[PDB]
Design a protein around this ligand. Structure first.
Ligand SMILES: [Ca+2]
Lengths: 58, 223
C-alpha cells in the first residue's frame, strides 16, 4: 500500500543486468525488470515473495 | 555494447562473464585465479564463465569456475560510485591457453585520445532491449577530464574517466558492467556507469584502473 509501491521501476545509471522485482499496480502483481546495480529505489526486490509481502494490495 | 561489432570467437581471451543463473556482469582475468570487475557487480553465488563466445550455447572452450572470495574496494561508495572496483578469487585456477588468457595491468595512466577496446554481452540498443548471444566489441577513445566533468557536473572523481563519442550512438550499456577497457594491451578501465546508453553528450564513465594497481597486486597476494 505504500506510495513507493506505485513508482515505476528504476534501472539506474550503473551497467549491470540484474533481474529484480517491482510491484506493478496496474497489473496488481510483482513483475521483473532490469536493475543496473546502483542507486536502487524502494520498489526493487530480490524475490517475488518479498515484493508481494511489502507491496501486495497497493 | 551499442553500435559495436561482433568480436569473433575468443578474440578477447581475458573477457569473462559473471553468472548468477544468467549473465549479469562482465569481468577481466588478471591471472589464473583472479578476476577484476566492478564493485556494484557484487552478488553472492557468482559463477565465473571463461572462454565464452555465445553465452547461451556450450561451444566447447568454456571453463565454469565458482568464486571463492569477492573483495570489494574498502572505499567503494555506493552513492557516488567512487572506487567501483572488485576482485574475485576463483575457487580453482583456470587453465590458460590461447582462448583463455590474462590481461596485463597498466604501469601508467592513459591520456585523452588513446583508442581502447571495450567489450561485453550487454544491451545493443540505446532505446529498447536486445541482448546478444555473442560477444560485442567497440573501439572508443578516452576523453579529457575537462569534457568528462562538463558532461557530468559534480559527479566525476579522480578515479573515473569518460570514453566514447559525444555524438552518441556508440557506448557500453546494461550487462557490460565490470567488463574491460583495454588500451595498448593494458587494462585501463572497468565499465561502470553513465546517463542511459549512447546518448548525445553523455559518454560512458569507467573506473580508472591505473589508480589501483598497487592495491590490486597486494590484495591478490594477501588472499
Ligand atoms: Ca558458450
Amino acid at each position: 500500500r505504500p506510495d513507493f509501491c506505485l513508482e515505476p521501476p528504476y534501472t539506474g545509471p550503473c551497467k549491470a543486468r540484474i533481474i529484480r522485482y517491482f510491484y506493478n499496480a496496474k497489473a496488481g502483481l510483482c513483475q521483473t525488470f532490469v536493475y543496473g546495480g546502483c542507486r536502487a529505489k524502494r520498489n526493487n526486490f530480490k524475490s517475488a515473495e518479498d515484493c508481494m509481502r511489502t507491496c501486495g494490495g497497493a | 555494447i551499442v553500435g559495436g561489432y561482433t568480436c569473433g570467437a575468443n578474440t578477447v581471451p581475458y573477457q569473462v562473464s559473471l553468472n548468477s543463473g544468467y549473465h549479469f556482469c562482465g569481468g577481466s582475468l588478471i591471472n589464473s585465479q583472479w578476476v577484476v570487475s566492478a564493485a556494484h557487480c557484487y552478488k553472492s553465488g557468482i559463477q565465473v564463465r571463461l572462454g565464452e563466445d555465445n553465452i547461451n550455447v556450450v561451444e566447447g572452450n568454456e571453463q565454469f569456475i565458482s568464486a571463492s572470495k569477492s573483495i570489494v574496494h574498502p572505499s567503494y561508495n555506493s552513492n557516488t560510485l567512487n572506487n567501483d572496483i572488485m576482485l574475485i578469487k576463483l575457487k580453482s585456477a583456470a587453465s590458460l591457453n590461447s582462448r583463455v588468457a590474462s590481461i596485463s595491468l597498466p604501469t601508467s595512466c592513459a591520456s585523452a585520445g588513446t583508442q581502447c577496446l571495450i567489450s561485453g554481452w550487454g544491451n545493443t540498443k540505446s532505446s529498447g532491449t536486445s541482448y546478444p548471444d555473442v560477444l560485442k566489441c567497440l573501439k572508443a577513445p578516452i576523453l579529457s577530464d575537462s569534457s568528462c566533468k562538463s558532461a557530468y557536473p559534480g559527479q566525476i572523481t579522480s578515479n573515473m574517466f569518460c570514453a566514447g563519442y559525444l555524438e552518441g550512438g556508440k557506448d557500453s550499456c546494461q550487462g557490460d558492467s565490470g567488463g574491460p577497457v583495454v588500451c595498448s594491451g593494458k587494462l585501463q578501465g572497468i565499465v561502470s556507469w553513465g546517463s542511459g546508453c549512447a546518448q548525445k553528450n553523455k559518454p560512458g564513465v569507467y573506473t580508472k584502473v591505473c589508480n589501483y594497481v598497487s592495491w590490486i597486486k597486494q590484495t591478490i597476494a594477501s588472499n
